[PDB]
RNA sequence: AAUAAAAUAUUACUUUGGAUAGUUUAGUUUCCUGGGCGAUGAAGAACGCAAUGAAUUGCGAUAAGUGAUAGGAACAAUAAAAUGUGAAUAUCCAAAAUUUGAAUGCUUGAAAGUAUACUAAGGUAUAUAUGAUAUUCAAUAUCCA
RNA sequence: AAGGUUCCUAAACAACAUUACUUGGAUUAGGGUGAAUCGAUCCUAAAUUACAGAUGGAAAUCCUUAAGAAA
RNA sequence: GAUUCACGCAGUGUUAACGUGCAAAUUACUUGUCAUAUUUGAGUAUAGGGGCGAAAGACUCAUCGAACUAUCUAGUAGCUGG
RNA sequence: UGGAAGUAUAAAUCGAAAAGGUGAUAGUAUUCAUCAAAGUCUAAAUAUUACAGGAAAACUGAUAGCAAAGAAGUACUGUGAA
RNA sequence: AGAUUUGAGUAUCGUAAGAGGACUCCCUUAACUUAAGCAUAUCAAUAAGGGAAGGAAGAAAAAAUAACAAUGAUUUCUUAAGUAAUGGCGAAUGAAAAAGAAAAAGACCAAGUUGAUA
């Protein structure tokens, strides 16, 4: 595994695109030498590609995917795939506020006699 | 002696086992510990009146009941809107 | 000539693959599963049979997702 | 276990076939099937009265 | 058949490739008891039923 | 009358068989904590992916693994390459996640397919029932110029 | 139709084809199936199955153009 | 819906062969029949107190005077064996 | 249903109120006692052999213990359920 | 033309489905078995079939017990108790108040009133 991830991340957009043709060139090039009789070093540079383009694809749709989420985070209509984990169960039920909502009577009641602290003496 | 016994049906799945009893102690304990810890007057078991039992069986007997009637509270003269946030049952 | 001879003219096939449960179960002529009873939206399960809700159920395979979710 | 030696659908062969008639497993196709079954004798069946739990 | 469905005849094609035997150099491996696949079946012997 | 080839009996050794003894990374039962799936596509099924893999394991066209954070020098059956400028290994994280499956554009037998709209090829949306809002309509159904 | 690699070649004969086999539809490793015109795909036959509707305590059943602001 | 031969098909007789078979119903000769109430492939429809039956309680996957499979179920046994 | 001249539910018919229900032997009357139906919500104490993670054992120790101590619901059988 | 009522098509934002069902709430008129036969009864809210749920669920604040020197929502455990009762009064089935504990908590709609009414 040869990229240097450091060196991903520096470089532009355009340039991951003719990084990523190049590898893609490369890899496909390196499959016709292992079936045409190639040489075991030639065989192990064909894993160590793939995994170029695994780590090149990764920086590519990480960086794509964050620039989004920085523009839909004030959006109202955010998309699905951006909208905070939960489970199903967990989008259904009633917020903590809507839990705890009580009625003006039982609010203001609950404020004139609340429960007080005492002890009995022994 | 004529044998009355109600085996007939499946039983099996009948039998209730008391293998938990040893940790309903534990859980009870540490749960009744644990209300002390938050607010101990609330695990104080709030005050109850005295009342008798019922039937002529018992009736020499008194026992807490539940709640103080409307009635005591206004001859003790505690207003029945406090009783209830100061550790006192009221029943009406 | 019931036991031999008849089974010569065996070539023609009841239950093909199903999709759904992928057991040769799919039933040709009725056009339905013997064994995930498809069409049906819901899995065909019975309480006699206690092995065939074994065989096949929660758990008897990859599951994908929600392996992540009961450990989260 | 409840079930343990229990899990089979088996059967009594009956008599006129040569052979007792403790129950036999069903099917064809594995060396298991033919063979005993349930009862405490057998191979691979439920033991004498079960130790229960309880 | 000469005559077959696209996907019936891929399942064919892996009936094919699952009918091998163990490689020899997975047979070296350091405790290794895998000597002969015991899935294995020939045409004449049993048919797979598909 | 005679023979010990066969036959029989005992012990030693060898053989077919796997009992017995020693042992356990497996089970059984009870108890404690939770009981955390799915249209944001679940459980299940199918196919594919390792330098040499058939099963199994892990994974999804970024393939027995990618990024990130911890982690500190290995793996090995045989070669290679990479490696303290960070190998293995771990994960409730990030990206990614093929064909199906409630399966949900229409069709589906073992079926290969295919229509419209938006952004040639690719990718999205379009099943049924249903709540609120908006818009377009229908019926002199009630009045009504 | 059914079978599913049994097809062709090479190496090799431990097992299998009631002796044996240098043979094999058996072991191992490779190779092999090319369509604008042949078929599937298209149409409909006996028949089959949907939305809405009707029926049922229920699962589900009936209806296939009749019941529908559908087709 | 005449008489016969042939490709085929059935199963009258030998109550032949075989009867730990070639075969969980077959073989040889003989006999009959061999196109319209004929023979036959595929598709399709009919399913358990149900179907189908030129009717034998026949056939419904070697299982039929009520199939196969699983649960009730370790059904009950004054009877037999240990 | 233990509820016995009807304890509960449902159907057909009938069908209240200037209230009324209950006091389990049917009926009428007069007292007594106790509640106030025909709408809704509500923590805690309670259950658990799905499943996941743990801890224990006068349990079994490869014909035993789960069917499964190895690629076990696998090899293999059946058109299929199994 | 206009003011309403009612019913549709489309668009937007969402909602139900399927898995699991050990424990929870229910629908349905099984039989083997016992009664030394058997036909009511027993097996038995049991098997199978079907629906719906959660981390628990169900129930819950008296048209409730009792006849007392009276209690006081619900739930669960002990006792009452194999008792009252039911039953070819045969085989068999069978509760509950009282009393002792674990825990404790009460609040709303409808109807009525206020209407320069919101």
Request: proline share 3%.
């Amino acid at each position: 595994a040869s990229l240097k991830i450091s060196a991903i991340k520096a470089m532009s957009k355009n340039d991951m695109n003719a990084k990523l043709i190049e590898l893609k060139g490369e890899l496909a090039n390196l499959r016709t030498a292992k079936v045409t009789g190639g040489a075991p070093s030639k065989i192990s540079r064909l894993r160590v590609v793939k995994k170029d383009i695994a780590r090149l694809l990764t920086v590519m749709n990480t960086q794509r995917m964050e620039a989004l989420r920085k523009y839909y985070k004030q959006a109202k209509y955010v998309p699905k795939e951006l909208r905070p984990k939960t489970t199903r169960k967990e989008r259904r039920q009633l917020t903590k506020a809507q839990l705890n909502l009580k009625t003006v009577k039982a609010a203001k009641k609950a404020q004139h006699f609340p429960a007080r602290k005492f002890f009995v003496l022994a | 002696a004529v044998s009355n016994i109600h085996f007939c049906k499946d039983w099996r799945s009948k039998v209730h086992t008391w293998f938990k009893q040893p940790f309903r102690k534990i859980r009870r304990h540490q749960t009744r510990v644990e209300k002390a810890k938050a607010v101990f007057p609330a695990t104080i078991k709030s005050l109850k009146p005295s009342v008798h039992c019922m039937n002529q069986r018992f009736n020499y007997k008194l026992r807490l009941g539940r709640g103080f009637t409307l009635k005591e509270l206004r001859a003790a003269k505690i207003d029945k809107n406090l009783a209830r946030t100061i550790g006192i049952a009221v029943d009406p | 000539t019931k036991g031999t001879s008849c089974r010569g003219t065996r070539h023609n096939k009841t239950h093909i693959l199903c999709k759904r449960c992928g057991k040769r179960s799919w039933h040709l002529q009725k056009q339905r599963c013997a064994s995930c009873g498809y069409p049906d939206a819901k899995m065909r399960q019975y309480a006699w049979g206690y092995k065939a809700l074994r065989r096949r159920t929660q758990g008897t395979g990859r599951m994908r997702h929600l392996k992540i979710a009961l450990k989260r | 276990s409840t079930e343990a030696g229990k899990q089979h659908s088996a059967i009594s062969w009956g008599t006129g076939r040569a052979v007792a008639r403790i129950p036999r497993i069903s099917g064809s196709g594995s060396g298991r099937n033919g063979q005993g079954a349930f009862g405490n004798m057998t191979r691979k069946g439920h033991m004498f009265s079960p130790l229960k739990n309880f | 058949t000469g005559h077959k469905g696209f996907s019936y005849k891929l399942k064919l094609g892996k009936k094919i490739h699952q009918n091998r035997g163990v490689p020899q150099w997975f047979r070296m491996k350091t405790g290794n008891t895998i000597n002969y696949n015991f899935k294995r079946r020939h045409w004449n012997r049993r048919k797979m039923g598909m």
